Structure formats: C-alpha cells, structure tokens
C-alpha cells in the first residue's frame, strides 16, 4: 500500500488506460469485452467500453466516470482523458516518489493546465467551412468506408459534408439555421450512385397511399400520424331492429360510413395530407381518396417527425385526440407549400416539397447497391455528426495532434521561464500532452517519437497554424504521424472540446494524488 496503492491507483488506470489507448476512438482495434464472466462482447471506443467494462478499482472508477463526464459534455477528449490522468500520474509518479510533494507540481500542472489553454484560446478558426473539420471531404472520407464511394470521399463528401454545412435546412419545427438538428438525408440503392443529390423537401421513407389519393397537392395541410388510423371493430349501427333485411345491411353499413362522414369531416376539420408512421388501413385511406385528400402510411419515424416538425402547427405524431374512426380535431394540421408525390432515386414516395412553414431539403444517397447506402450511411450520419458539432462549435482550434507537440514546447517554453520546481511542474505537464499523438501511433502503427519528436521538430516559434505544417505545427493524421495543413486533411479539434479534457485530465489525478491509502483503519 501507500505508494504501492498509489501506484495501484496509477497502475489500474494505465492498465485499463491501455484498452482506451490500444483502442483509441474508431481507429482503435476491436476489443473483446467480457460482459461479466462468460459473456464476451467485441467492441471498441474507450469512451464506450469503460461503461460495458466493469470497474474493479476506485482508480478506474473515476476514469470511466470522468471519461463519461468528458463524454457527457462532448464526445471527444474522452477515451483520452482516461490515459491523461494516468499519463500525468506517470509524470508525477516518480516525482511524488522523488523529493516531490505533488501539491507543488500539481498546482503547477494547474497553471500548466491553465497556461496551455491560452494557446488553445489563441488557437481557433472562424471559417473551417470549405476546410471542413478533419479536412472537409475527409469529414465524410473518414465517415465513408471506401468502396464505391471511395473517390466519392471527395464527390459525395463535397455533398454530405457540404450538406450539413450548406443546404437549406429546417431545424426542429421549420427552423432555418446552422443545424445542430442534423439534416434529413436518405439512401436508396439503384440507378447511378453519382446521381445522389438533394431533394427540395423532406425525403420520406413512406408507404405510398395513392390509389387515386391525389399525388400532387398544392397548399398541402399535412397530418403526420404516429397514432395509426387503425380501424375499430363496431357493432350494429342505427337502431338494432330488423323488420326487413336491408336495414341489417345499412345498420352494419355505417361501420364504414360514419368514418366516411367523419373523414370528410377530416376535410372539414382539416388536412390535405395524412402522413402516418403508424398504420392506415385502406378502409380509412380510401375515405381520404374519395375525400380527395392524401393519406400516407408508415412515413419513417425520423422522416415523418422531420415533416411533423417543419410541417408546422399541431401534428398527430406527438398528439392523439383522434381515434381514426373519429374525425380530426385539427391537432393534425401540418402545412406543406405543395406536396408533389415524386419519383426519386428508384423510389416512388411522397416527397413533401419545402413546407408552408419552411423550405425543407433532404439529400438522398443513391446506392450503386445497398453497400453505398450501407457505407454512405456512416458518411451520412458521421459527416453529419462532424459538421453539426462544427456548426454547434464554430470556434475550433486548427490542428489536433501537432497542437500537443506545440503545447508541449509551447508549455515547455513556459516551463523553463517560470523557475524553481514550478518550472519543473510545467515541463512535466508538457510531457503528458504527447501521448495523444502517440496513441495515434498505436492504431496507425506509427513510430511514437518519430511521430511525436518530429512533430515537435516543427516550428519557427511555437504555434499550430494551417499556414505551416512544416515551418510550424498544424493538423495530424490517422493516416500517418504527420502534421498536415488542415484543409488537405489536418485533424481539427473543436476548441470547447479541448480545454475540457485538458481541464479534466488533471482533475482525475489530483484527488487520486491526494488519497494516501485505500485500506481499513
């Protein structure tokens, strides 16, 4: 115990911190995680596994927690902040053992944790836009597993990454703005893949209800229904009594007719279009087609609620006062500029063009086969995830990795200047910075020093700028250990993402750095 348990506080970290170093984000290898004892699970993403991992020691206790605390705030700096505590816990490891009360250097690590962000503060980019984040096309080119979309890791990456960046887009409830709301984008395999483009509207995944349901509808009042239109089993209608047989026909005829009456009250109450993520039996659906109104079925939960948001006003997706045997209460009124039921991307689907309350735009990514729609899926979603955070955070540092090599030297310069042991404190904080590019040497199989020492070999003064990847720092690669000018592919980091892990990484150790024993008294 003592320094032993203090090491066990460090060891259990670096032990488990291996699994987050050896599996670093997506490029980290698959790790087989035994759920408890006999149930094994293959996975990765140290931001994730630690939770499926079941923490043995109070050391890794906070690690899974602080990584999640980092992860709750933002998804990056998470699998790392695990290591970085241990990485500092390795920096102060022999220090605490040497002469050092870490209280000295940890408060120096703090000012170091502080002084460093003041480069991250001065390290920003306003327009990363045609530069993207992790390049631009490489927001998708990373998001694309590259087979038929591989060179389209330029082409469709000029699409899906520029989509979230620039397309007319409706946030929650018909809202133009830089999306943190993602983008509605679909995938339909067929035709020519390069033909994948934007549609003006929401791209629906929907069972089309046009039997003579009017396809094109101008000024379309939209009813998007998560509540189905079902049907209701119903007994005898008007009266019970049969003197002559035809009443028994009419008595059981109002089963359909009262809804025929009420679905043309649905004309009266309102909608021109019925979108239903639930079911519409053609029993109800026909009542709309003979009403001259649109009724659409199993409109994708996303796609429908995407309409059900932009469509405006009240919508049955989030509401039910309707039975579907019942007439509408006009809690079902969404609004579309025009609904033109549209042939798109080997799909005949209702495509709701723009909105009354908005102008909607949805790309459909046409798979050469499903595999594009399979691989562009991530390209859809992950390059979505990228630019959303890019639009969410428009203050983002240039460079991910060579920042630390700078931040080493940037801080290591501030080290030698301060003096005394706090000079030493700052230098040992400039060390732990260099493991994040080195855990890139894990997955890319690079050479850590030849990676990181040569990263530090790049400078005039200390700085990370898309100006200079050679005369100074910028970028870094999952492809190499090589800094890059960020628009080719440099690794961008969001500024808000960085200072957090920076902040947090020292905040796991210092308390662990305080606790002097684990055991009973």
């Amino acid at each position: 115990t003592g320094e032993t348990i203090r090491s066990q506080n460090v060891m259990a970290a670096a032990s488990i911190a291996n699994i987050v170093k050896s599996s670093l984000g997506p490029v980290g290898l698959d790790k087989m995680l035994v759920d408890d004892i006999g149930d094994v699970t293959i996975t990765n993403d140290g931001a994730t596994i630690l939770k499926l991992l079941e923490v043995e020691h109070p050391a890794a206790k906070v690690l899974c927690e602080l990584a999640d605390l980092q992860d709750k705030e933002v998804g990056d700096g998470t699998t790392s902040v695990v290591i970085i505590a241990a990485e500092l816990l390795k920096n102060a490891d022999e220090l605490v053992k040497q002469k050092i009360h870490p209280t000295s250097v940890i408060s120096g690590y703090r000012l170091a944790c502080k002084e460093a962000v003041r480069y991250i503060n001065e390290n920003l980019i306003v327009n990363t836009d045609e530069l993207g984040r992790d390049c631009l096309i490489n927001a998708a080119k990373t998001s694309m597993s590259s087979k038929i979309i591989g060179i389209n890791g330029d082409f469709f990456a000029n699409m899906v990454v520029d989509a979230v960046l620039a397309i007319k887009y409706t946030d929650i409830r018909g809202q133009p703005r830089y999306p943190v709301n993602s983008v509605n984008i679909l995938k339909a395999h067929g035709r020519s893949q390069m033909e994948s483009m934007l549609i003006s509207g929401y791209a629906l995944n929907c069972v089309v209800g046009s039997q003579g349901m009017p396809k094109r509808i101008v000024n379309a009042k939209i009813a998007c229904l998560d509540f189905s239109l079902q049907k209701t089993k119903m007994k005898l209608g008007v009266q019970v009594v049969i003197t002559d047989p035809e009443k028994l026909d009419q008595i059981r005829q109002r089963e359909s007719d009262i809804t025929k009456e009420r679905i043309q009250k649905i004309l009266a109450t309102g909608a021109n279009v019925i979108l239903t993520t639930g079911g519409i039996d053609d029993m109800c659906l026909k009542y709309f087609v003979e009403a001259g109104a649109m009724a659409v079925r199993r409109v994708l939960k996303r796609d429908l609620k995407r309409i059900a948001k932009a469509s405006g006003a009240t919508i049955l997706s989030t509401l039910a006062n309707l039975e579907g045997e019942e007439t509408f209460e006009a809690a079902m009124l969404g609004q579309a500029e025009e609904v033109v039921q549209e042939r798109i991307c080997d799909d005949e689907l209702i495509l709701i063009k723009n909105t009354k309350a908005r102008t909607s735009a949805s790309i459909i990514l046409r798979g050469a086969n499903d595999f594009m729609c399979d691989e562009m899926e991530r390209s859809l979603h992950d390059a979505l995830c990228v630019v959303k955070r890019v639009l969410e955070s428009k203050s983002v540092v240039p460079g991910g990795g060579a920042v630390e090599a700078a931040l080493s030297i940037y801080l290591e310069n501030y080290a030698t200047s301060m003096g005394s042991r706090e000079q030493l404190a700052i230098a040992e904080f400039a060390r732990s910075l260099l493991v994040i590019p080195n855990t890139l040497a894990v997955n890319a199989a690079q050479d850590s020093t030849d990676l990181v020492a040569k990263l530090r070999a790049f400078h005039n003064e200390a700085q990370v700028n898309p100006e200079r990847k050679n005369l100074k720092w910028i970028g870094l690669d999952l492809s190499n250990g090589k800094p890059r000018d960020n628009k080719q592919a440099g690794v961008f980091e969001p500024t808000i993402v960085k200072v957090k892990s920076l902040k947090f990484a020292t905040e796991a150790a210092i308390t662990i750095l305080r606790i002097d024993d684990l055991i009973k008294l």
Partner: protein, 509 residues
C-alpha cells in the same frame, strides 16, 4: 482477459485447433472426428457443424469463430468448416510476423485485397450456371448431395429440391434475389409410398393441425385463420363486468355471442367449413364453430396459420371486423385432410402469393422420409444459392491455386508489406489441396508443387485436386461445383472473421 500476441497467438489457438480435424473432416474424402460425450458417449463428425456445439470453448476468439461458423450455417449450412478453416488458416502465419512488422492493420486491408483478387479470380473460374436446366443445376446439386451422401434420395430429392427452391422462387424484392427457401418446407408423413416425396404448392400443414372433424376434406369452403378473438367480447368490440346481480347477467351475454356473431356474421360470409383459430380459440368459441357447421380447429398456432398464410396464401386476420375470403383461405382454396399414415394431413394447396410452395415428402417411414428430408437440404440450399447466384466454379485446388498464385502474383504485383498477408492468404488456399490430399493419403507436397505447376501452365483455372480422386484435374471435367454462391459466401465470411479476431489485439472484461 488477453492482450497482444496472447490474443493473437491465442486467436491461433482458437480457430486452428478447431480447424485441425475439420480438414480431415472436410473434402469429399472427409474423415469424421471422434467425440467423447460428457456422458461417456461418442459422436462421429465430418461436420464443422456439430463439433463446435459439443466441444467446450478453447479460447474467446473461438466463441467468435463459432458464430461465423454459425453465420455460414445461417447463410448456408455448409462452409461452416471452411470459414473457421480459412480465417483460422489466415491467423497462424501473417499476424505475429506482421506484429513483428507491427500491424494488425496492413493485414486487414491486405485481407480485403486478399479477398478481392479471388473475387477477381472467381468471375472467370466462377462462371454462370443455367438455372433453367435442372441438370445444369443438378450437376451442382449432385455436387451438393455427393459428399454428405444419402445416395438413394440424393437422387430424387435433388430434382425435388431443384423444384423446391424453383417452385418457391418468385422471389420479389424488386431485385429478384433468390434467398427464398422457407416457403419450401419438408413434410413429416407417416406411412405412404417412399416416392411422391415431392414439391406441392403452399403449405400442407403437418404440424399442429390434425382432426377427426375437419370433416375429411374441405375443398371449396375456406380455411379461416384467426388471429382474432373467436371468443366472445362482452361489449361492442370490448368486455364489461361480470355477474354480481340479476341485472348484469342478461346484459353480458348479448354482446358476447353477438361479437362471436358479428365476427361470424362477417366470418361465415366468406364460406369456411374449417375455421382454424390460433388465438381466440376456446371452448364456447370452438363450440360455436361446432354449432356453426364450421370445423372447430384447436391445438393450432401462428406457424400453422402463417404456414396457412403460406399455404392458400391467406392473411391471418388482424381485424375483428369484416373477415373475407382473401383474408383467410385465399382463392377458391383447397383444404385437403388426408391420412397418409394415421396423421390427418392438412393439405392446403392453391397458394396465393403463388410460388410459395412446400415439399410433400413421403417415405414408407420417417427415416426413409428423413433420408429424403436430409438430401433435400444441401440440394435446395445450393439450389437456393444457385438460384440466388446463377454461377458455378470448379472446386478443390482450382479456386485455391488460381487465387493462390494470384494473391502471390498480386503480392508480387504489390511487392510491398501487404504482400506478406497475400503470401499468407494464398497459402490458406492451399491447405485445402493439402486437405484434399491430407485425406486421400498421397503426398500433397508433390501435388502442391505440381498444382503450383498446374498453375504454372493452366493457372489452375478449372484444375484442382479432386479430393476423392486425390489428383490434380479439371473440375469442369468432373462437374464438381462449388458455386460463386457457396464459395464466395463461405470465403467472404472467413475474410471478415480473420480480420475480426485480428481486429482483436486485446481481450478484456
């Protein structure tokens, strides 16, 4: 919890020890594995299917290898051997040397291009079979039944299994993929002729539907499939309180039977003499059928009516209101209750959503029936695969060496790092020519190099070693067919799988 080589060499300790006897257990000369049951028993297996089940787990990666043997069993049911063979055959050579070259990675993208050059090699050597001609399939389809070998019904059941997946092929996704099997199903028939083991439309129901009163046949009258509530509902569509009073009792029974009525007002209009009630089946409900001059059908379930939904092509009624013909017993319908043996066989032919067709299999006994039932499998599976993929490829060392030097040529084409996995993956191909000769008893070495020479001249285009003749020969000659279906499907799996456990450098908890 494992890490590094301990995973990697342990990964080698996973699939290879699995795939060790399996190669003896594989090939047309396949040598069974002896097993020792926990009871003290024995199971003799050429199967990669049975071994992994019984044998206890020897490594965590094996638990992953088991499932890709399952995935191939899921995909086909054969190739389960090779998927754990091929992937485990990739694990022994490349990784540790290439971890000494420091990467799982370069091996992966190598495995990926170790995959494609075969996919590049195949399209020549994998060459379209004609699904039109039965014998053009049956040569593949005899190639399916020839190794597992129940010989008598490896004759007829093929033409049956040919017709099976053929008659169950309409398949419409819009892309005309043929995975379509389930419509084709065996029939467990007591007694009867060993022949007339054959494909009939729909699903003749052998499972839960056997009755003295269906009458003995209901042909034109419908078979009525109720998901819905044949039992009474005390309210309109609903139910109300029970009897504490004189007032409440009379009020209850009205809408109860009236629901059964208003059901069988709309249920009787579609003309069943047999209503099969899977749910809502109850004494008073079926007693009503007994009283409705419509057969009361109990001890019957969803599979039944889903098979009857697959038989006449009905849609099991989800609406308590307004039952109709095309709901249940689609078309004029045939419900044919035949005792071949003492089991009443519900024969529901006349399928709507046609080309959904079961397989009437009749032995004189269940074994000689199961002898049809087992031979049907590989046939109809490969039929499915041949109907899926209308191509065939020469088996044995043909695909092995033609890709082997290819990957080797590709490795020389690259002359890089990933060549070394190509060097490792090309040899993974050649353990099968070993495996084929490691069965017959000659020296594969002389033939390996000669099969290298078979590539030196012919690129081992159609020329493999044929396991049972143990010599290096054209398989278009011998008509020995792995399809681009069966093989690439098997090869695809292991290609991912070796990557998978190689994507594992760390096992944890």
């Amino acid at each position: 919890r494992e890490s590094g080589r301990k995973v990697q060499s342990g990964n080698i300790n996973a699939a290879k020890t699995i795939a060790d006897i399996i190669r003896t257990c594989l090939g047309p000369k396949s040598m069974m594995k002896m097993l020792l049951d926990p009871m003290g028993g024995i199971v003799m297996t050429n199967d990669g299917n049975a071994i992994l089940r019984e044998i206890q787990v020897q490594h965590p990666a094996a638990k992953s290898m088991i499932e890709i043997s399952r995935t191939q069993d899921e995909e086909v049911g054969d190739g389960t051997t090779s998927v754990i063979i091929l992937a485990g055959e990739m694990l022994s050579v490349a990784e540790h040397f290439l971890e000494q070259q420091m990467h799982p990675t370069v091996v992966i993208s190598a495995y990926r291009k170790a995959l494609d050059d075969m996919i590049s090699t195949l399209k020549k050597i994998s060459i379209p079979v004609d699904i039109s001609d039965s014998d053009m399939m049956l040569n593949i389809i005899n190639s399916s039944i020839t190794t597992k070998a129940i010989s008598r019904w490896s004759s007829l059941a093929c033409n049956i299994a040919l017709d099976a997946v053929k008659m169950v092929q309409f398949e419409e996704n819009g892309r005309k993929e043929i995975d379509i099997k389930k419509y084709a199903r065996v029939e467990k028939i007591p007694g009867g002729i060993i022949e007339d083991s054959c494909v009939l439309r729909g699903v003749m129901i052998n499972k839960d539907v056997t009755h003295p009163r269906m009458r003995r046949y209901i042909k034109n009258p419908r078979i009525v499939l109720l998901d819905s509530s044949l039992e009474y509902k005390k309210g309109e569509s609903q139910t109300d309180i029970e009897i504490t009073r004189e007032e409440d009792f009379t009020r209850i029974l009205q809408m109860e039977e009236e629901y059964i009525q208003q059901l069988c007002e709309d249920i009787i209009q579609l003309k069943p003499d047999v209503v099969i009630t899977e749910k809502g089946i109850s004494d008073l409900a079926q007693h009503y059928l007994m009283r409705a001059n419509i057969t009361a059908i109990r001890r019957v379930r969803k599979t039944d009516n889903n098979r009857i939904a697959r038989a006449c092509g009905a849609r099991i009624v989800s609406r308590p209101e307004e039952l109709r013909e095309d709901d249940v017993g689609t078309g004029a319908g045939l419900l044919e209750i035949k005792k071949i043996g003492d089991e009443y066989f519900t024969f529901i032919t006349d399928c709507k959503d046609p080309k959904a067709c079961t397989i009437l299999l009749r032995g004189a006994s269940k074994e000689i029936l199961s002898e049809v039932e087992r031979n049907l499998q590989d046939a109809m599976q490969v039929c499915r695969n041949v109907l899926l993929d209308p191509q065939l490829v020469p088996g044995g060392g043909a695909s092995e060496m033609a890709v082997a030097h290819a990957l080797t040529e590709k490795s020389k084409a690259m002359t890089g790092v990933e060549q070394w996995p190509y060097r490792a993956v090309a040899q993974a191909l050649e353990v099968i020519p070993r495996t084929l000769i490691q069965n017959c008893g000659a020296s594969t070495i002389r033939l390996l190099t000669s099969l290298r020479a078979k590539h030196t001249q012919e690129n081992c285009e159609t020329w493999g070693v044929n396991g049972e003749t143990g010599t290096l020969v054209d398989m278009k000659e011998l008509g020995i067919w792995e399809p681009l279906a069966v093989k690439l499907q098997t090869y695809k799996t292991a290609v991912e799988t070796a990557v998978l456990l190689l994507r594992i450098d760390d096992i944890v908890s």
